[PDB]
Amino acid sequence: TISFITWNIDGLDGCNLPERARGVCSCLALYSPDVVFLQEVIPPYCAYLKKRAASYTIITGNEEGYFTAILLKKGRVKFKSQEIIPFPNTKMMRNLLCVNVSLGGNEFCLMTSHLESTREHSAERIRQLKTVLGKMQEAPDSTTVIFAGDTNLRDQEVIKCGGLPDNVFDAWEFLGKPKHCQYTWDTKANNNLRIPAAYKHRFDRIFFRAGHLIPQSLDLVGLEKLDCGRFPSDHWGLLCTLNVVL
Ligand SMILES: Nc1ncnc2c1ncn2[C@H]1C[C@H](O)[C@@H](COP(=O)(O)O)O1
Ligand SMILES: [Mg+2]
C-alpha cells in the first residue's frame, strides 16, 4: 500500500501564510504520506517545508514566482530521475513535473501540474490536459504512472479533450464517485477567499494507469480551521491510498 496527498496550498494568498504553512505541515505529519503533490508553492514556503517537513525530499517544478512540488518520504521512496515538460502557451508559468522513483519493488512515474486557471482559459487548459494524458501513455509498460494535481477542470471539459485514454482512470470515479470527498474546492464550507455565494468543484483529481494497482480509499484533509479563523488553504487536501495486487 502506497499513500499520497495532492494539495493546492494557496501560496498566492499572503494573509496568514506563515500560520497556514504550519497548518499544512501539521496535516502532513498526521497522515505521513509516502508522497506529497503540492501546487501554488512559493520560495519562502519551500524553505519552510525544508526544515519543518525534513523527512521529505523536495523536487520543485521551478525556482521563481510560484510552482508545483513533489515530496518523497526519505527511506521509503527513492529518487531516480526527474523531467520537466513545459506548456509552450501557458501564461501562468504552468508546466508538467515528472519524477521517476522506486517505492517497494515497483517503479513509479509521479506527475503533477497546475493547469491554467479560470473559465476563460478553458481552451489552453484542455490543450494542457492532452499533453499530460499523452505523457502518461509514453511511459514504459514496466512503470506505474500516477498523476495528481490541480486540474481546474469543470463543466465536463474532459470530453472535449477526447476523454481519458482507455488505459487511464480517475481515482475518484474508479471508487464509484464517493460523495464525502466529491468536491475539493467549496466556498460554502471554505471562507478563505471571502465569497458570499456557494461554488463547488472537483478541481483536484488523480489519474493513474495500470490491473497492476488499484485505489483503496479517498479522503479530504485540511478540514480544521486554524487560530486565525481560516483554513490552511482554499482547497481541501486529497488523501489517496493505492494498493498493489500480488
Ligand atoms: N484571478 C482570479 N479571478 C477569478 N477567479 C479566480 C482568480 N484566481 C483564481 N480564481 C478562482 C477560479 C478557480 O476556480 C478558483 C481556484 O483556482 P485555482 O487556480 O485552482 O487555485 O479560484
Ligand atoms: Mg489558488
Curated annotation (Swiss-Prot):
It is found in: Nucleus; Nucleus, PML body; Nucleus, Nucleolus; Cytoplasm. This is Tyrosyl-DNA phosphodiesterase 2. Mg(2+) binds at residues 10, 40. Its EC number is 3.1.4.-. Belongs to the CCR4/nocturin family. Can partially complement the absence of Tdp1 due to its weak 3'-tyrosyl DNA phosphodiesterase activity. The record marks 66, 185, 203, 235 as: Interaction with 5' end of substrate DNA. Interacts with TRAF2, TRAF3, TRAF5, TRAF6, TNFRSF8/CD30, TNFRSF5/CD40, TNFRSF1B/TNF-R75, ETS1, ETS2, FLI1, SMAD3 and ACVR1B/ALK4. Widely expressed. Expressed in whole brain, cerebellum, quiescent cortical astrocytes and cerebellar granule neurons. The chain holds residues 123 to 370 of 370 of the full protein. GO terms for cellular component: aggresome; cytoplasm; nucleolus; PML body. GO terms for biological process: double-strand break repair; neuron development. It is an enzyme of class 3 (hydrolase). Its cofactor is Mg(2+); Mn(2+). Residues 8-12, 114-119, 152-154, 193-199 are annotated as: Interaction with 5' end of substrate DNA. Ubiquitinated by TRAF6. The gene is Tdp2. Keywords: Acetylation, Cytoplasm, DNA damage, DNA repair, Hydrolase, Isopeptide bond, Magnesium, Metal-binding, Nuclease, Nucleus, Phosphoprotein, Ubl conjugation.
